[model samples]
Target: GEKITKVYELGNEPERKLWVDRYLTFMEERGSPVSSLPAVGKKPLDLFRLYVCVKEIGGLAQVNKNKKWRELATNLNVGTSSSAASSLKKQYIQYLFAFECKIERGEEPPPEVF
Candidate 1:
């Protein structure tokens, strides 16, 4: 017997558009200062590794467990200071939220690095 799989669809068009609008508004209000971490001297590979680490741990909440963030940083060969951890978490969350918003708006997402 062949089993059929159900594919869930996105929300109604209106709802999707509203969310995309809200996401843009939120980004504008926050200003560009919080847009992204200073990636000037950072290696793109390390950044990708950080994203993988966060995703594997099931987002930010798990990273807060027993300073697990430090372990991730050490693995990524980045600064193990609290400030570094804060910046990493902040940037990761920003990227993820924006990625979701793009999907809602039916826009093309960034390249899949992970």
Candidate 2:
């Protein structure tokens, strides 16, 4: 198991995978059972979810892709750190909750490079 961080700070494949698992768990608990992820191509959220899975599985997406995720985290005012504080974690959680709300409203957030 890897240490938790404030923002999306998965340093390695194992850490990334663990983060993904915990993220899914967080969403399932914080969101409705019928909720869905962002859509992509013909796959819809299937593709989006798959993309995340691939990243966790040692997939190397372009730097631009990773940058976009970082940008989103920046916009959310969350900083990635090995030892993030509780306040920052709350911000990250709020951001996730906000995303879930958008999903609940049937809103399709713009496609992120990541």
Candidate 3:
């Protein structure tokens, strides 16, 4: 999994399909059941969620005793090595929440790639 750092650190894959039926007994007892991941089409919440997930996973994503991520976390003022990644996640969460609030009030955020 150390290849994760080199490969952009996201895992959206078809695991070696033991091919068990994942969603069996879908007795839809649902109150905001975790949203199904959409196919390619993205909304702002989805994008923000990706950022959140990345920050969280970054905490566990060391590659062979590497400090590259630790340096990055520090630079982001995320935290010291003890908790930098989660701090980064919280920062991102607050940022995105504020952004969504702005959008709800008719303020458009900057373009995503800018």
Candidate 4:
């Protein structure tokens, strides 16, 4: 029989897309949301989590279309208001594109990207 190549062993496109899909699915299946206020300061961890949430929802368009930002804010305990969500969304998008570039170049993303 022929040997089967592991998903992780494949090219960056396949592996990265697979990971993106999985994360998105996980977000969709996530548990109940919580209540919290938006903090004035955001940490690196918070930015990373926001990035994951945005990626999981299949990008910014879907997030806005579904109004999932508030949910994301609640789940991450970041905020519960549109303005708060907007702020977090802006920050994550910056990191999201940065991380995407790294993936495209097949470079290992920094720990903060995680």
User: Residue-wise lDDT of candidate 4 within 43-91, one digit each (tens)?
Assistant: 3323334555676886666787998877887677767888767766675
Candidate number that wins on TM-score, 2 or 3: 2
List where candidate 2 sits over 4 angstroms from the true fold.
1-12, 33-37, 43-114
lDDT of 1 by residue, 42-109 (tens): 63323334544665775566667756766766676665787666666665565444544343355654
Query: Residues 1-114, candidate 3, lDDT per residue (tens digit)?
Result: 122122122333353111111111111221222233222212112332333344444422331145444454554444456465444444444433333333334554456675
How many residue pairs clash in all the candidates, one count each? Answer: 0, 1, 0, 1
Order by TM-score, highest first: 4, 1, 2, 3
Candidate 4 collision pairs: 24-56
lDDT string for model 2 (1-114, tens) is 122232233234455555455556655665533234332122122222323433443232332345344433333334343222233334333434444334335555556567
Question: Which candidate has the top score in TM-score?
Answer: 4
Instruction: Give the per-residue Cα lDDT of candidate 4 at 61.
Output: 69
Query: TM per model?
Result: 0.43, 0.26, 0.22, 0.45
Model 4, residue 8: displacement in angstroms?
21
Superposition error at 10 for model 4 (Å): 28
Clashing pairs in 2: 39-44
Better of 3 and 4 by lDDT: 4
lDDT of each: 0.48, 0.37, 0.34, 0.52
lDDT ranking, high to low? 4, 1, 2, 3
